[PDB]
């Protein structure tokens, strides 16, 4: 196997970590356990710590002149690496084997991410801005210090970014479908419609075939038909908010005539290439600056509560029937979008 390593520029402080992409199971979440190696002579009398933060950051660390860091924390925790703290929280096999490699100069450290936290998510930076843009990011820091309130310094501290990401469940739920009957103000003559998908869960980039059915037992004409996939980004930083944007859509000019029926399947794919310039589209967790897919849809746990801080993101398809001289009608239906469990 392999390990990821980061160290201070002085070389006296080094952090080893087992994985960068941590996964949660909605009933359990993998720990961030690892080991930190420190020069026992360099620390003198300073104490040694690791601290975890999940923050609603903004801007970038490029030393640009931006309106940097609306740095609201959602969660923060600390652990004492040195002097040796008592037993809690006994080493896992990975910790023990790291110790076998590194020797007594290393000390284990541990965390548990609370269940009530998001995945890594980033809002697409607008091209008119500079540098990075807002998105809840995990970060683990380690330092040698006189006190937890003591001033920071580059030689005293070290930084390492990590991700928390979710993968598809083992079995799908019910197929998404919806229907409507647009009767007019007094008469029985009506416009009727349906829509459905292949399944509720899709892999990124795999085409959605949305089924559509129309039954126009009325005098009016369905002028144009449109399919859109809408992305919903719930922002819950301190006051509830959401920002919603179309990420792909297709138009069909195949009008439905009065007293007529129609049905078809439309093929649509959510994808990033043609959305490059659009600000506010939520992307999945970037490590530093990498390209990556549209944000995988966060799924709530079986036990509901609010279960939300930071960014929550979901998708819906909607089909709109444009009708002559007004009276338009639409139908809306959800689906989830994420990678399959790697193996």
């Amino acid at each position, epitope marked *: 196997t*392999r390990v990821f390593k980061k160290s201070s520029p002085n070389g006296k402080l080094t952090v080893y970590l087992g994985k960068r992409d941590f996964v949660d199971h909605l009933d359990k979440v993998d720990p961030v356990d690892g080991v930190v190696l420190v020069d026992p002579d360099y620390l003198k009398d300073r104490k040694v710590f690791v601290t975890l933060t999940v923050a609603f950051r903004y801007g970038r660390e490029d030393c640009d002149v931006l309106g940097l860091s609306f740095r609201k924390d959602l969660f923060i925790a600390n652990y004492q690496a040195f002097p040796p703290t008592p037993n809690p929280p006994p080493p896992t096999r990975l910790q023990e084997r790291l110790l076998r490699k590194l020797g007594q100069h290393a000390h284990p450290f541990f965390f548990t991410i609370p269940q009530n936290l998001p995945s890594s998510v980033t809002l697409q930076p607008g091209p008119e801005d500079t540098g990075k843009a807002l998105g809840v990011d995990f970060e683990i820091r380690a330092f040698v210090a006189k006190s937890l309130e003591e001033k920071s310094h580059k030689r005293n501290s070290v930084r390492l970014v990590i991700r928390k990401v979710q993968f598809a469940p083992e079995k799908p739920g019910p197929q998404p479908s919806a229907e409507t009957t647009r009767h007019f103000l007094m008469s029985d003559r009506s416009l009727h419609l349906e829509a459905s998908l292949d399944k509720e869960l899709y892999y990124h*980039g795999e*085409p959605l075939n949305v089924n559509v059915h129309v039954t126009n037992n009325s005098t009016k004409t369905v002028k144009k038909i449109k399919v859109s996939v809408r992305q919903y980004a719930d922002i819950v930083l301190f006051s509830t908010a959401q920002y919603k944007v179309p990420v792909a859509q297709v138009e069909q000019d195949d009008q439905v005539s009065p007293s007529s029926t129609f049905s078809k399947v439309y093929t649509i*794919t959510p994808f990033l*290439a043609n959305n490059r310039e659009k600000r506010g589209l939520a992307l999945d967790g970037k490590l530093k600056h990498e390209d990556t*897919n549209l944000a995988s849809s966060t799924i709530v746990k079986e036990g509901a509560n609010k279960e939300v801080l930071g960014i929550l993101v979901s998708y819906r398809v909607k089909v709109k029937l444009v009708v002559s001289r007004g009276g338009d009608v639409s139908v809306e239906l959800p689906f989830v979008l994420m*990678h399959p469990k790697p193996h």
Partner: antibody
Amino acid sequence: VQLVESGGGLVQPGGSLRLSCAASGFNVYSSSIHWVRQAPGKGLEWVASISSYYGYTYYADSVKGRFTISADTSKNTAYLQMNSLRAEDTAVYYCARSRQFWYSGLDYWGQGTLVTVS
Amino acid sequence: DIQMTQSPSSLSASVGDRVTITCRASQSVSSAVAWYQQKPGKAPKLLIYSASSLYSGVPSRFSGSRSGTDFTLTISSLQPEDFATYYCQQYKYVPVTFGQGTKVEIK
């Protein structure tokens, strides 16, 4: 799942030609098309690529500006145009799939087609 | 370029032997190595990806593992269908690159 090539044959020195790669059973919005080549009996070399989901394309420095790439996502096929063929570039050419999320080697290989210059 | 060295340029064996092939990266590419098999004339097939995980459908008598920057492909028990030539690759940095090629045959 299958992947098919067409367009090979013979070309004049200094001429130009176009090659095609039609894909069956995988989508060009959760995949990618890579082109790699092999002079007869020699070790194969990577030349050109398209990654449709992000929109980027990449090329090797030995062919930049002379080769060019495009793909159609409704017909689910990829094409490349080669300008000014030369003795350095006559070879067999393959098109092949790679997983998009995330890159895991060239899974499915087209049956190979060849580009003589004469 | 992430240039590649591969040796021995040719090998030889008999049925049932255990054979080794090495590919050495000119730079410390982490684990993005993959290995392919080419029969004469025919198109390739991929054998090992991410330098350790053997690909589906391949008989498990193929095997490889990482060692620093010296990647090793072996055949656990060579059989009369293995006589071909094999190629090394890395895929972390574009442009992806190439082995020199190494044949395997009876004596």
